[PDB]
Symmetry: D2
C-alpha cells in the first residue's frame, strides 16, 4: 500500500542559488515534520512562504526562504512524507474598546508573569513612529520600564523621534506635551540624529547621560534588545540602524522566534514583514487606525490573533493605565 | 461706507437677484447710517432687515416671507471672522495638516478637559453658554457611553443632539448590557443579543417616551437617563434609516433642524463625537465663534465638515470610545 | 404528530400602536409564507427587521415595521407555520477594477434589455452629492439619458449640486470642468435653490427651460421617478424634497420594490436606509471609497450583492465608457 | 547681507552646533560677498561650502566628512520657495482642503494628461527633464498595470522607482495573467493562483535578472518589459517584507536612497501611485520646484506626505487602477 503521508519525502537538489526545483513544497507557518530515510525529522524554524531544505546525513531539516536556497540544497518536493502540526471576528472599529484593552492587559500580565518565572517567552513590540506622533511614546516607555517588553522591532524614525522627544520635547518639531509646533522645530530631528552620531550610538548616549528618558533609554537600562531596520525614507540614519533589508530581516526573525506574543503597533510594512517571519504558535495583537491595515494583518495571521482598529496614541495611554491597575 | 442695499422678497422663499448669502461669521449691516448687528450668524442663509425696528436677522431661505427686506450685494456690510494669529507661519514646518491622526493625543485631551472645566464653571455662575454634544451611535458601540453619561451626570453637558440610533443603543446597553448585541464590558456577542435593540425600542414605545420609562423604573442608567434626571434637553432627529423611531424622535428634518439651531447657537462649545451627519448638520447651523471640536476615527469626516464651511473646527482623529474614557479621567483629575 | 413548520401560526393582537407582543417573529428580507386556518398565505412586501401582521378573514398578511403596527393588529408570534423562501468576497480596493466595471456594464446592459422587453424591473440608483463633487454627475446623467436608470433615490444635496452644475458650472462653488474654485462661488448653491424655488419645482424648471442639462433634467425628460429625502443638514430645501423621514422612507420602499438591481453610490446613510427596505431578490452593487462603508453595505445584503471599494467619480466615468462601448 | 557663517565638521557625520538644516527649496549662500547656488536642494540635510571652488552642495549628514565647511545659523542665506499666488484667498469658500476625494476627477485627469504631454514634448526636444513614476504593487492589483506599461511604451516615462512587489507582480501578470493569483481581466481568483507570485520570482531568479528574462523570451509584456525595451531606468528598493527579492533589487536602503535621489532630482514631474513608503521616501529627496502628484485611495497617505515636508504635492484621492485607465485614454486623445 502506498500512503503518501508516511512515504519517504521526495527531494531535489537546487540547480542554482535561489532557484527552486519544480514541484517544491511551499511551507505553512506551522511546525512541520518530514520523513527522511524512514525517520521523521522535525523541521527547524517554521515560517510560511518558504521551502524545506533537508540534510539527510545530518538527520536534520530547516525552513529556507528562496533567497537563502543554495545550489545543491536538497529541497523538499512533491506530496510524500510531509506532516504539518498546527497548534491546538469581522474587522471593525465599532467594538467595545475599554473592554478589549482590559482583556489585552490581563493577557500581557499573565505572559509577563510566566516570563519572570521561566526566563523565556515574553512580548515583542513592532512599532512605527506614529507611536511618537500620537503622544503614545511615554506610555510605551513605561511598559518597557515595568518589564512588559522583551524586544522592540522598529526603524530609524521611531528611534529618532523618541530621542527627539527626550532631548527637545518634540516629534518633527511638535511639542509632545502641548501638541503645539515649536518655531524652527523642523531641525530638531536632525539635531537628535547628530547628537546620537556624536555619542557614537544609542547605548553610549544612554550610558553617558546624553539620553535620560524614553523608549530607547528604557531598552538600554533594562537590557531589552531592539532591531532598527533601515528604510529608504530614513534621515541619517542613526548608527544603530541596520541599513541592509535582508540582514535586518534575519535579525528580526531570530528576535521574534522565541516570544509568546507580538504586539503590532501601526506600521503596515514593519508589521507585515514581522508577521511573515512568525510561526503560527506566537500570539498576535494587531493595532491600527485603518480597518484595511488591520485586515491585511488578520490575513497572514498566526493561529491566535486579534485585530483592534483604533488610534495607537489613546490605545497605549489607556492600556498603560490598565497595566498600572494590575500592578496594584 | 454706503448704507446696505435692500430689496423686498417678491414671494415666500424667493429672493431678489444679487441677494447676499451669509458666511458663518457675525455680520453687521449699515442701515440709516447706523451699524446693526445681524442676529444669529449662520452660513448659507440671508439677511433680513427691519429698518424701523433697527434690527436684522439671519433667515434661512425657506423662512423668508413676501415683502421681507433682503440684503443685496456686498456694500454696507462688515463680517467679523475669527482673529488671525499675531504672526505669519514659519517658512518650513512638519505635521501642520488641519486633519490627521498623527498628533499628540494626551496633550489635546488635557487641553479639551481644561476648557470644558472652565466652561462648566462659567455656566454654573451665569446660567448661560455651556456645552452641547453632537453624537452618533459609535459612542455606544465603542464603550464610550458610560463616560459620556457621567459627564452629563457631573453637569458638563447642557444639550445633546443625536438621532434614534444613539438614544436607542444607549437604552439597549442600559436594559441589556449590549449595543448591537455585543456586551459593553466584555466586547463579546451574547446569545440572542441581536434582539436587544428592537426589545429596547419596544420598551420605550410601550412606556410612551424616554421620560416615562425613567419615571416607571424601566430605564435606570445611561446617557438618556442622565438627561432626564438632570433636565438636560436633547434633540433626536429622525432619519430615513429608522424603522423603529422612539416617540421622542422628531421625524421632520426641518422641524428638527430649527430646534437644533436654537439649541446650539447660544453654547460656548460644541463637541461632535463620531457622526458625519450630525457634525455637518450642526456645523451648518453654528456661528464661527463657538469653540467646535470634531472627534472621529475617519479623517475624511473632519475634512468633509471643514470643506462645508465649518473651518473653525478643531479635528481630533482618534477612537471615540477610548477618547471619552480618557477625557472623563482628566475631568475627574481637575475636579479633585 | 406536531410538526411546527406545518402547524397553524400563532398570532397575538398588538396591545398598543407600535408595541409588539411578546414572542413576535422578526422577519428576514426573504419572501415569507404563513399558515393561517390551514392555508398558506403569501406575506406581502418582504423586508427585514419587521413583523408580520395577519388578516385571517381576508386571507392576507403583510410585513409591517414596528412604527406602522396598530393596536389590535394580529402579529405573528412563536415558531409555528412560518415558511421562508430564499431566492435560488473579502472587501478590498486592491482588486482588478477595469475588469469588474466591464462585468457590471454587461449586467446593466442585460437588465436594461429585459426592462425594455417587459416594462418592469430595471435599475434604481441610490446617490449622494459626492457623485457631483467628484465630477461623476455628467456620467450618471448620460446613463439616465441612455435608458439605464428607472429611478433615483437621493436627497436635497445631490439635486442642488447637480442643478448648481447645470446653472453655474460649479458644485459648492468649484468648477466641474476645471476643478478650480470660482470667486464668490460659495453662494452658487443657494442661488440654485432660489432658482428652483422661483420656478416652483424641478419639473417646472425643466419644462420652462431654466434647467437644460444634468441628472434631474434627464429624469424629467425621460420620465424617471426620483425620491429626494430631506435631511437635517439640508440648505433650502428645494420644493421637491420630502422633509419627513418616515414619508420619504415609505416612498423609497415602494420605489425600489419592483427593481431588478439597485446601485448604491457613496452615501452610507441613504444606502443603508435603502438596503433595509429591499427584499433579498434584488441585486445590489455597493460602491464607496471607504472599505468600512462597503463592509457595512455587504453586511445587510440581498442574496446577490457585490461591493466595490473605489472612487465614484472615476468609477462612473469608466462605467459610462463601457456602457457606450456596448451601445455599439 | 552678512556672509554666511561656516564651521568645519569635527568628525565624519557629526555637525557643529547651530548647523543649518535645509528645507526642500532652492537655497543660495553668501560666500566671499558672492551668492553661490547650493546644488541639489533636498530637505533635512546640510549645506557644505567649498569656498575656493565657489560652490556649495546639499549633503545628507551621513555623507558629511571631517573638515567639510558646514553652514551654521541663518545669516547669509536666501531660500526660494514656490511662487505664492497673486492674491489672498477668499474670505469664505468650500471644498478647499488640500487632500480630499471630493474633487472633480475628470478635470484633474485632463490637466495631468496635458502637462505630461507638454513635458514629454520638451524631453524629446532637449533630452532632459521628463517624468518619473513612483509606484506600489496596488497599480497591478487594481488592473492599472497595462495602462502604465503603455505610458512607458509611448515614451512618457523616464524613470520608475518602486520595490520588489511592484516588479514581481507586474511579472506575475505578464507570465500568468494574475496578481496575487487574481486574474487581471476577469477579477476572479484562478485555481492554483496563490503559487503564481513565487513562480514569477523563481523565473526571474533562474533567468538571472529582468533584462535576461526579456532577452530569453521568458518576459514578453508589462511594465518592466517596456522599461527594458525602451531603456527606461528603474530603481527597485529592497524592503524587510521581501523573502524573494529578484536580482535587480537593491537590498541596502541607503544605496537605494542615493540612487533614487540622483534619478529624480533632474525630472520635471514625479507622479506617485499608491505607495506610502515610496511617496514619502521620494518626496524627502526632491526639491519643491518639481511638479509632484500623489495619487492614492487613502487620503491619510497624501496627508502623511505633506506633513513630512512635501507641501508642493497635488493630492488626487482616487482609485489608482481606474485613474491609470482613464489617464491613458486622455493621453491617447491628445496624441490624436
Ligand atoms: Ni484566533
Ligand atoms: Ni452574492
Amino acid at each position: 500500500a502506498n500512503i503518501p503521508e508516511i512515504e519517504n519525502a521526495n527531494l531535489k537538489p537546487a540547480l542554482k542559488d535561489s532557484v527552486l526545483p519544480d514541484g517544491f513544497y511551499s511551507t505553512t507557518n506551522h511546525p512541520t515534520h518530514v520523513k527522511v530515510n524512514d525517520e521523521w525529522i522535525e523541521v527547524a524554524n517554521p515560517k510560511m512562504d518558504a521551502v524545506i531544505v533537508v540534510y539527510p546525513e545530518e538527520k536534520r531539516a530547516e525552513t529556507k526562504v528562496i533567497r537563502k536556497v543554495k545550489k545543491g540544497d536538497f529541497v523538499l518536493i512533491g506530496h510524500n512524507g510531509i506532516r504539518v502540526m498546527p497548534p491546538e471576528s469581522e474587522v471593525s472599529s465599532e467594538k467595545p474598546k475599554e473592554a478589549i484593552i482590559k482583556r489585552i492587559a490581563k493577557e500581557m500580565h499573565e505572559i509577563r508573569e510566566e516570563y519572570k518565572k521561566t526566563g523565556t517567552g515574553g512580548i515583542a513590540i513592532v512599532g512605527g513612529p506614529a507611536i511618537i506622533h500620537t503622544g503614545g511614546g511615554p506610555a510605551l516607555a513605561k511598559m518597557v520600564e515595568l518589564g512588559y517588553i522583551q524586544a522592540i522591532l522598529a526603524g530609524n524614525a521611531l528611534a529618532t523621534h523618541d530621542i527627539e522627544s527626550a532631548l527637545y520635547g518634540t516629534s518633527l518639531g511638535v511639542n509632545i506635551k502641548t501638541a503645539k509646533p515649536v518655531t524652527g522645530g523642523h531641525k530638531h530631528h536632525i539635531y537628535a540624529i547628530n547628537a546620537i552620531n556624536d555619542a557614537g550610538n544609542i547605548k553610549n548616549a544612554v550610558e553617558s547621560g546624553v539620553l535620560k528618558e524614553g523608549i530607547m533609554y528604557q531598552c538600554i537600562k533594562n537590557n531589552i534588545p531592539y532591531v532598527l531596520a533601515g528604510s529608504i525614507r530614513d534621515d541619517g540614519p542613526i548608527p544603530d540602524v541596520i541599513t541592509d533589508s535582508m540582514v535586518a530581516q534575519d535579525k528580526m526573525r531570530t528576535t521574534v522566534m522565541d516570544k509568546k506574543m507580538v504586539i503590532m503597533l501601526s506600521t503596515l510594512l514593519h508589521s507585515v514583514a514581522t508577521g511573515n517571519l512568525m510561526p503560527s504558535y506566537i500570539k498576535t495583537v494587531c493595532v491600527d487606525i485603518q480597518p484595511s491595515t488591520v485586515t491585511k494583518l488578520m490575513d497572514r495571521g498566526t493561529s491566535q490573533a486579534i485585530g483592534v482598529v483604533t488610534d495607537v496614541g489613546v490605545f497605549l495611554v489607556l492600556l498603560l493605565k490598565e497595566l498600572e491597575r494590575l500592578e496594584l
